Amino acid sequence: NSQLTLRALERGDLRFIHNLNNNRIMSYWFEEPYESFDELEELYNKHIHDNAERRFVVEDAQKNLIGLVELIEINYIHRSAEFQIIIAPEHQGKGFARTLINRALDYSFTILNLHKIYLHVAVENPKAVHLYEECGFVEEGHLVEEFFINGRYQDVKRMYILQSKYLNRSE
Amino acid sequence: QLTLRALERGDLRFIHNLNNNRNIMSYWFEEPYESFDELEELYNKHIHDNAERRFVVEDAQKNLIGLVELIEINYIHRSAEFQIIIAPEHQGKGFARTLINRALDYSFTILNLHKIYLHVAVENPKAVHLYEECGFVEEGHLVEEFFINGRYQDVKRMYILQSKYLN
Amino acid sequence: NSQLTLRALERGDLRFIHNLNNNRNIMSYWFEEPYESFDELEELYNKHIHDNAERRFVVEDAQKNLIGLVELIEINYIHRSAEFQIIIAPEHQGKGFARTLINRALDYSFTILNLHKIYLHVAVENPKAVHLYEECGFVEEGHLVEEFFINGRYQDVKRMYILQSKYLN
Amino acid sequence: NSQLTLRALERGDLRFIHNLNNNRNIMSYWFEEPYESFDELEELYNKHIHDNAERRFVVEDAQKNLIGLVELIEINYIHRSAEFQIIIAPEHQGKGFARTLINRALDYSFTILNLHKIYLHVAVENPKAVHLYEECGFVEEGHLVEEFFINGRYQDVKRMYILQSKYLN
Amino acid sequence: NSQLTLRALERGDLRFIHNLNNNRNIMSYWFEEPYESFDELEELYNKHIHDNAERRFVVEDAQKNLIGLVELIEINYIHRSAEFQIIIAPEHQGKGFARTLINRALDYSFTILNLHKIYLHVAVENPKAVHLYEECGFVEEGHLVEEFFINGRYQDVKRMYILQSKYLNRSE
Amino acid sequence: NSQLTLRALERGDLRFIHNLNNNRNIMSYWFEEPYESFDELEELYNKHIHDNAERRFVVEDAQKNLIGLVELIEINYIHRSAEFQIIIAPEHQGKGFARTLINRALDYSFTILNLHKIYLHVAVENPKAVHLYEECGFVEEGHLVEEFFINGRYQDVKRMYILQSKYLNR
Amino acid sequence: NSQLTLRALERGDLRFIHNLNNNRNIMSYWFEEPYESFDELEELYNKHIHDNAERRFVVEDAQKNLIGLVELIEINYIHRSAEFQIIIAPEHQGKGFARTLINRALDYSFTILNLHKIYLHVAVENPKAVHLYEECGFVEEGHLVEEFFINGRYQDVKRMYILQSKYLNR
Amino acid sequence: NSQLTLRALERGDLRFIHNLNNNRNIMSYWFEEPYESFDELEELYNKHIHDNAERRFVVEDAQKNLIGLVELIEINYIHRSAEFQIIIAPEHQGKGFARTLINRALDYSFTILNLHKIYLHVAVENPKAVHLYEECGFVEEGHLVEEFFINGRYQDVKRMYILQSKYLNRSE
Amino acid sequence: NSQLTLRALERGDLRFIHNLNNNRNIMSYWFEEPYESFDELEELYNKHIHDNAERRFVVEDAQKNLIGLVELIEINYIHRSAEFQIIIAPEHQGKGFARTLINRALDYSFTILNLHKIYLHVAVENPKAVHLYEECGFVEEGHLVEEFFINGRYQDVKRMYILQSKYLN
Amino acid sequence: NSQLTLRALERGDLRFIHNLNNNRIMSYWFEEPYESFDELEELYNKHIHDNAERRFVVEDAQKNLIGLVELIEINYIHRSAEFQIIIAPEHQGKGFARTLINRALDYSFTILNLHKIYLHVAVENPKAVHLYEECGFVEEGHLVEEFFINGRYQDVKRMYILQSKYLNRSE
Amino acid sequence: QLTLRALERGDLRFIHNLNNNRNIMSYWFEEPYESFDELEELYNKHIHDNAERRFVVEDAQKNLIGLVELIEINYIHRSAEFQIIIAPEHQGKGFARTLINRALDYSFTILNLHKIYLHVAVENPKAVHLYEECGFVEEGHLVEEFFINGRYQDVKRMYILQSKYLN
Amino acid sequence: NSQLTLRALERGDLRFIHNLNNNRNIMSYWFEEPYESFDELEELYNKHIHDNAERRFVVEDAQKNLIGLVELIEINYIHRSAEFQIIIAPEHQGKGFARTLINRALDYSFTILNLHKIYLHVAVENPKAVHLYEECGFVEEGHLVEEFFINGRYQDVKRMYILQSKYLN
Numbered sequence A, J: 001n002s003q004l005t006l007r008a009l010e011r012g013d014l015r016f017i018h019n020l021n022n023n024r025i026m027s028y029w030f031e032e033p034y035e036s037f038d039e040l041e042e043l044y045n046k047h048i049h050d051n052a053e054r055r056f057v058v059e060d061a062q063k064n065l066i067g068l069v070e071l072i073e074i075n076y077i078h079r080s081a082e083f084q085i086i087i088a089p090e091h092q093g094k095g096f097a098r099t100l101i102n103r104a105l106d107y108s109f110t111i112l113n114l115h116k117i118y119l120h121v122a123v124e125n126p127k128a129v130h131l132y133e134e135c136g137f138v139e140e141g142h143l144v145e146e147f148f149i150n151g152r153y154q155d156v157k158r159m160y161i162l163q164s165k166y167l168n169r170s171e
Numbered sequence B, K: 001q002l003t004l005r006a007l008e009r010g011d012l013r014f015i016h017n018l019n020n021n022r023n024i025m026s027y028w029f030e031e032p033y034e035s036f037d038e039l040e041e042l043y044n045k046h047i048h049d050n051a052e053r054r055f056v057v058e059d060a061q062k063n064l065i066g067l068v069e070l071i072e073i074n075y076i077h078r079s080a081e082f083q084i085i086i087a088p089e090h091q092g093k094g095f096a097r098t099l100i101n102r103a104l105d106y107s108f109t110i111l112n113l114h115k116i117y118l119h120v121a122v123e124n125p126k127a128v129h130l131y132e133e134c135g136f137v138e139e140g141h142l143v144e145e146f147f148i149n150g151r152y153q154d155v156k157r158m159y160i161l162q163s164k165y166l167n
Numbered sequence C, D, I, L: 001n002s003q004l005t006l007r008a009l010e011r012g013d014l015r016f017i018h019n020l021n022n023n024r025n026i027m028s029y030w031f032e033e034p035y036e037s038f039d040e041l042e043e044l045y046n047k048h049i050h051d052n053a054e055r056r057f058v059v060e061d062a063q064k065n066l067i068g069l070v071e072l073i074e075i076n077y078i079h080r081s082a083e084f085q086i087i088i089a090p091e092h093q094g095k096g097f098a099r100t101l102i103n104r105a106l107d108y109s110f111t112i113l114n115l116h117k118i119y120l121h122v123a124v125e126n127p128k129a130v131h132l133y134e135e136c137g138f139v140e141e142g143h144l145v146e147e148f149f150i151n152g153r154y155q156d157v158k159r160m161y162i163l164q165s166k167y168l169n
Numbered sequence E, H: 001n002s003q004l005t006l007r008a009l010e011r012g013d014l015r016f017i018h019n020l021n022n023n024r025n026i027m028s029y030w031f032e033e034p035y036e037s038f039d040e041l042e043e044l045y046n047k048h049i050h051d052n053a054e055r056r057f058v059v060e061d062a063q064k065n066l067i068g069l070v071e072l073i074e075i076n077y078i079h080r081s082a083e084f085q086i087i088i089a090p091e092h093q094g095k096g097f098a099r100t101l102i103n104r105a106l107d108y109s110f111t112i113l114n115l116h117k118i119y120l121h122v123a124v125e126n127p128k129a130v131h132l133y134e135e136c137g138f139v140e141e142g143h144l145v146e147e148f149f150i151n152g153r154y155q156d157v158k159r160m161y162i163l164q165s166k167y168l169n170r171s172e
Numbered sequence F, G: 001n002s003q004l005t006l007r008a009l010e011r012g013d014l015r016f017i018h019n020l021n022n023n024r025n026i027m028s029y030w031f032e033e034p035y036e037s038f039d040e041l042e043e044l045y046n047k048h049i050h051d052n053a054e055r056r057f058v059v060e061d062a063q064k065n066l067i068g069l070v071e072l073i074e075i076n077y078i079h080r081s082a083e084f085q086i087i088i089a090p091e092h093q094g095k096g097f098a099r100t101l102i103n104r105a106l107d108y109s110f111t112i113l114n115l116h117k118i119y120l121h122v123a124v125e126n127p128k129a130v131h132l133y134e135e136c137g138f139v140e141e142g143h144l145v146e147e148f149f150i151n152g153r154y155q156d157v158k159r160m161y162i163l164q165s166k167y168l169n170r
């Protein structure tokens, strides 16, 4: 966790982003759909100045690719963003995520000066829900039949935290 | 008495005139604009993009009544976010429910969407009641989601499924 | 004054902007590029049409007379700040409009754009103007020494600011 | 300490620039456009190579160790002014290089570039830095209230300046 | 004299510029490219519209008659210097407007552009013009031998200059 | 001096040009555009590759040490004139090369390029250099008052010239 | 002849150029590229707008009738020479304009553009035109054998020249 | 003599071309643009690669030593004429290879390009070269007065030509 | 019949060209690319305007009636040859223009363009046309078997030629 | 029918093509999907040199827009194409179609020298089927549940004619 | 023992090598190619186009076994044309049926297609019997559809529905 | 001969094509553009890579020696015709390969590309070659008079053709 680092995504990381798709569902890049890696590469150069989405690669002390932190739908009048996080499967079950959630929130709130961060979790992933609740996220919606995961439509939490809570919880 | 038509370049004026009678930032494919020239340039930029669709609401005499928008259209999960704008002069005439109906009809028989949701300010409880009466149900109470008119404001997220509407 | 409005700037407004910048007799700037001719202005307008670093609004009255311009420049969306300027057309000065325009700029800045801090520069040798901005809620945070070359000599300007917390609640 | 030289920044130095922003934990900007990734930086570098609004110099010693960076930005060539900042790589700090680099910045600014004024921003909460810039001839012309969002809160900065007249007599 | 204004040059004024060349019968230049046809002048104007090394102004009277042209060229913002040239249209020559235009150029150069030095060239075989410039505060700094090929032969020109400190603080 | 050769400047020589520009430690220009970054110089070079208003020669000895640079600028092919400058690397200043190079430059300007006149600028505060130029045939035609901001002050420069006819009918 | 004015060729004049080219009914060229279509001429014109190797003047009277065309081509600014041609519209041939225009052309070449030499070509089978040129100061320097395929056969042309010095020291 | 071949010029031969200029000390041209540096030569080569108004050939021996250069320029396919120029590298001068190269140029010009007339210029103060060309079948058609500025003065050149019918059917 | 002139084809003449292909009921081609629509033709025209492989001339009378078209294609400038064809608008046929236009084609080909050979293709089943080209000096050099697919079947064409030597003595 | 004419489609016709979509289903342009007219205009310039599809506008004596003839999937090694035809609804029921079928076949077989033309007709449009059978088209497939017309999946005939049949039927 | 992988630029060689061991014209997004350079250029041209998709068939050791192609993919009607190519060295080993299965599986559970059809030359009755045995049924006998090896040849069109396969 | 193959032409084959066109000593053409240098060839290759008007095949033997080239040019896909040429490398001539290459070209033309008619040009002054093509099924349809300038004089060529109906059934 002291071992872990965040780093802005670069071209050389696209291979890894594409492997993490393999683990599942579709992937998107600035909300443009892609399947193949050559597609992804083309989409990457196209949106390199686009500020609506930010990605960081997570590595350990020996430069292992651990996972991915994403902020999307960044809107700077509303000062909000959606947060996703993806851990390589050979690196889940080792605690790393809470640390990463903090790093991401810290960045959103101490550097981007965003006001709000929200996310979606599967209702039927009650561990993940509760994990976000522990980091300070509150439920604000139970989205009915939202996403088509594993052969049926499923409900998802949408959960949020605000900047004042993250930054002044301890005052 | 009321039609929907695919929007085209000639309608941009109308759209720009609606954005002004509302006095908040407007978006085109999630990009903000203020001037007509800004809109024109974004219209051209997003001509081939499916993430949003818009229909001009006219009457049998070609008066411009309002606008129907599907944004965040998701073709895998078969959902979209719906908005309506009615021109100031046609507000409070009884067109809103008819347009809601036409739009769900199109969305659920022609676009074959599974879900349609929307956002309504918490501070507009009458819009909220109207959408409840059209069959929408609350699925979220988004806290301080949107900075509107000088402070952050809550919105209800309201939805309807295809299975409900097609009964 | 109630019937004064702000409208986002359009290509057809550029003649007016050029004419305003003409009895001002200092160099004027579009997105930090100096210009003098309408033709260069028009070209800068087309080139920076999607740049969010500056925003401009034409002030009109009830029968659409062109009263003036509001500019926000140096907009930074992390610090949530912007510099601002007002230019009233010379034939509409001294009719009391200024205070209302200042209000409407602040109103846009703080109620639509969600900025935190607006600041401006006023010539030290225009104490009446300074006193005007003080009345609308601005406070001096800087007295910039020989900042601008104006009329053949370097001049001091007061830098004056107001926060969103103050204008709103 | 004459051991230390400036040289104009060029493409091989963008790794260093990137590595320096990594430590600092704020948004960094190339010609007012924000960037995070090396790739964003590289593309920005190529785009603005003909742009004279900002100028940068890498700092090296005898053995060409990469000590730090001098940045002039907001260069205006009618008013003859520029904002400056100075970044020393963490591992070369508190060796008393700052003063020397400040002098080189000023010397370039005033005997090569022919500017009239240089200004900078120093955190109010860093009175040591404020005091260093004072020993080097800078004088405080403002106290900018809640100017920057840094480390989770809005912060005041001193604005400090020196004129070409003072530096050269 | 009194009611003569400087306006930045526009695309519609290129015809005027062109007629002024035509009437004058030496090779002309735009951003150091020689041109003869209007169409080349137009293309050059478009190409160099953001180039700040040259600036041109059109002179008008109250009735909007086109009177003359002021150019600054070779403008350098480190040495803060420029070459200045002025042309009055044939039919407006000999009404003594030149002093008024020279003052406008100097004032723009020194109050709006904040330059340090403005210089110009005058043909040695035009001693009136030399004396005219001397009255307006220019001083000789060179006599440039066979500098220009003009009307079948190389001619000498005076080079003449004035400093911002002099234009601006003479009277202080 | 026998052994001093001129050749046309090339992309490989820009690093040399850049390093010379640094030692002089005044702002330098390519086709009247100022540069400081090697990368900007390089992009100025490509962009102006077909521009004939300036022409530049690297000076080499028999062992291909880089001695200096000869430039003509402001070349005008109607009036047939050009401005000439010469920079010798610091480590070869004072060895006697300068007259030889001036001569090579005059030679090229007047027997190849067919110019009529070549003028240069010399700091008024370097009178030994002014005399050097007089000894090679140049004449003072101007004393340009506060023409260049160089090392923190505006400086006067002699303008000095020679004509084709004089160089050829020697 | 008082009343004959030169002005620089413009886009509006190309229709005139095209119609002249037709009457002569030989293949004609723009910057050494052959054209026949007005549209190709027009696209050759835009493309070569900044090319100084050819320069062209329309000739007008006091009433702005189009009299003819003066061209210089093959302009070389090192050697200071150019090839000169002149076409008079058929309906103004034989009125006495030609000497006046040759003179205007020599005047421009030698007192404005500072060329050293101007040469032209005349069909060997038009000896009255060859004499006309001799009367204006031109001298034969070549008799070019089967140089041009014109009207179904290779034809000989005189090459004729005048120098700046002779035109000026008249 | 016998084992000398013509090969179309390639990008790798530009260095050779360039060294040949360097050694020769007059201004050189590529598609009528003057160049001095290799880098400009390279850019011009790229720009004009489909231009058929000029064609160049490199001369090699059996060991692939670079011997010389043949250019045809001003090629016109209606008059069917071209200007021809030949350059032998300093170190291969005086081995009498010139006749062999001139024959190759004439043969290409007249058998592969099907031109009608090839002409060239020779300095009047090089009467050997004139006589050399005359032996190879060229005839004088002009003595061009002060045509070229070369080594500090204008020089006269012979212009010299040969026709396809003569090269090809002399012997018939 | 000297009344008739050639002039080089240009953009205003593309309606006429298009209207002429409409009658003929075969594929028509611009520089070997097939086209059907005016828009395809226009775009093709612009693309190939600098291409010297084909040349076209519109034919007009005294009153500038649009009589027809002369087309040289496959122009090769080493071998000095070209394929030619001639199209007279339906309403101007059988007035004895063909011969005159054939002569103009040849005259251009051989006294302006300096070609060595001209050839054309005539349908075997049009022995009248074959005979016209014979009266004008053409001689048959081939009988191309099933060369073209026209009106639903493969057809033989005569290939007919004349040389510059013959035309000019 | 003597009154009718075929004419290669041009830019000015795109308005009409777009109105004929109104009558229904999706439309495509060189097998790129389009909805809006501004989309169609952009797609039109893009494929203007593309030879795989040919369209003709049908007009009457007074320039009325009657309908549309399309050849798509034109392949010139196999020498085949798919044929569609669309009549404006205010102009159906007037016989015009058989004439148009002939004009299209004539063009395919006398000018393009194609070998085969095929088409699809709804199985549940037995009149249209029989209409094509009368023009010389033979069934070669009954495509099961092929296209989703009016709320269920429907069967379609694929029918063909060859060049030798069209051209030599009478020999 | 056998995988499917999305095709990428590195696979072009393999594809080009398969096209050669077949000796008929090959197509990429309906455009013909012969050379590798031609293919490369078409690959780049169609990177963003959904009308076709291809999967490289590898084994657990990374040997290249063959290719699975969906072309004429129709996202409205939810159909596609399917082809398989097996590298010459792996023909007649019993991989074909497994690959058919994998491809229908992907098409009908992951791509959620309604229909998959194919073409098989009439003169290859054993391929026809093989596809019948995998569940495909004839829906057409396309007459002289394809010019292959010097004459026009008939093909069967054979199909399977999602409803059949998912029992 | 059985072990001779055709392979579609690749960029790396261009050296071979250039070398073949070199001991031929007549002007050679890529898509009707003349060329002489490899560099121009390479550039023409890139430019016409998607043009279907010409197709080329390299002939190799069992151990991939480069034997020769087959070209189809002037391909028209409505008339279904093409012109063809064969060039065997000088070190592989007179080894009996020609007849097989001719067969394989025809085979491609008629069994893969579905052309109707292939034709070629053969110098009248190469009667052995004419006799060769006659043996593979070609028939004279034209004797083209002074078609090509070759070796300093105009030359006759036989045009010789074969139909798909003849090669196949």
Ligand SMILES: [Ca+2]
Pocket (backbone or CB within 6 Å): A031, A073, B030, B072
């Ligand atoms: Ca979105």
Ligand SMILES: [Ca+2]
Pocket (backbone or CB within 6 Å): C033, C034, C035, C036, C040, E049, E050, E051, E052
């Ligand atoms: Ca400017």
Ligand SMILES: [Ca+2]
Pocket (backbone or CB within 6 Å): C032, C074, D032, D074
């Ligand atoms: Ca700024």
Ligand SMILES: [Ca+2]
Pocket (backbone or CB within 6 Å): E033, E034, E035, E036, E040, G049, G050, G051, G052
């Ligand atoms: Ca020019």
Ligand SMILES: [Ca+2]
Pocket (backbone or CB within 6 Å): D050, D051, D052, F033, F034, F035, F036, F040
């Ligand atoms: Ca610069």
Ligand SMILES: [Ca+2]
Pocket (backbone or CB within 6 Å): E032, E074, F032, F074
């Ligand atoms: Ca200059």
Ligand SMILES: [Ca+2]
Pocket (backbone or CB within 6 Å): G033, G034, G035, G036, G040, I050, I051, I052
């Ligand atoms: Ca042409």
Ligand SMILES: [Ca+2]
Pocket (backbone or CB within 6 Å): G032, G074, H032, H074
């Ligand atoms: Ca020339």
Ligand SMILES: [Ca+2]
Pocket (backbone or CB within 6 Å): F049, F050, F051, F052, H033, H034, H035, H036, H040
């Ligand atoms: Ca050059």
Ligand SMILES: [Ca+2]
Pocket (backbone or CB within 6 Å): J031, J073, K030, K072
């Ligand atoms: Ca298809």
Ligand SMILES: [Ca+2]
Pocket (backbone or CB within 6 Å): H049, H050, H051, H052, L033, L034, L035, L036, L040
């Ligand atoms: Ca070529």
Ligand SMILES: [Ca+2]
Pocket (backbone or CB within 6 Å): I032, I074, L032, L074
């Ligand atoms: Ca051809």
